[PDB]
Paper text:
Here, high-resolution crystal structures of the NHL domains of three of the four human TRIM–NHL proteins, namely TRIM2, TRIM3 and TRIM71, are presented.
The NHL domains of TRIM2 and TRIM3 were highly expressed as a fusion protein with an N-terminal His6-GST tag in E. coli. Crystals of TRIM2 NHL were obtained within 1–2 d, while TRIM3 crystals grew within one week and TRIM71 crystals formed after approximately one month. The TRIM3 NHL structure was determined at 1.7 Å resolution from the tetragonal crystals that contained a single molecule in the asymmetric unit, whereas the monoclinic crystals of TRIM71 NHL diffracted to 2.2 Å resolution had an asymmetric unit consisting of two protein molecules. Nonetheless, an exception was noted when comparing TRIM2 and TRIM3 that were most similar with ∼82% sequence identity. In contrast, the rather shallow flat surface of the TRIM2/3 NHLs resembles that of their homologue DmBrat, which has been shown to recognize a linear RNA.
Author numbering: 469 to 744
The structure:
Amino acid sequence: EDELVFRVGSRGREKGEFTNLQGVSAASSGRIVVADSNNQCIQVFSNEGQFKFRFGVRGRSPGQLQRPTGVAVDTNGDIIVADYDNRWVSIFSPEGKFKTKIGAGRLMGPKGVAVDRNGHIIVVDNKSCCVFTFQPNGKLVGRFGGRGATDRHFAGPHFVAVNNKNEIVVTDFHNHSVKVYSADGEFLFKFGSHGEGNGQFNAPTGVAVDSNGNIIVADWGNSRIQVFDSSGSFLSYINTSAEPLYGPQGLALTSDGHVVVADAGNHCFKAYRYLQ
């Protein structure tokens, strides 16, 4: 009878355990997909938290995972992994079969990924501080950003989401802000500032956008999740009181309308109801 619906995971390297849980995504087929950067693996669960399967071969060769940070699920259920250390994005089948890698030689530190409304793969690079837009096949179609603190630049972007207008929503871990851009890279607006007040951050991480354009943002340093309207107005905190967060990372919205968070500091993921 809590905003918390369920919790899955504990510390370790076995199936249903985590060392460094970072990326979170959801499939329309009603699955939850999580990446562990330190166990170098992807784990797939039902919408109720039941373990389905784990995949990932450790290493630096194509097909293999070295530091998988960011994950996204395509409309066909393909699993898209940002590998920060291999410096590419791996696309797998919904069953964990390597298909191809995109952005090799262009991405220097791919951290976060999303899928847009035309099936483009959106990658945020924490080393070049840029946002890349690819076709599934690997073809680059767009790039914007650059290191800095101006509205068109990023200081250290780790996560990305796309809204109903195909607009790109980037969290800036080091700037304490969220910035929103057109599909073409045009800056639209920013919100958030450094602090603990409503609509302030101490290092934003995961981000998701709902069907109503509400933007949901995890706050790593403040161990909390904020919900905003489409203009970046604070609406609420997710009520985490029953089982507090500790350093949350990825965020995703499921097909059954729950917010799932990588509660990395507690070695688990948690699913929430939220009222919008």
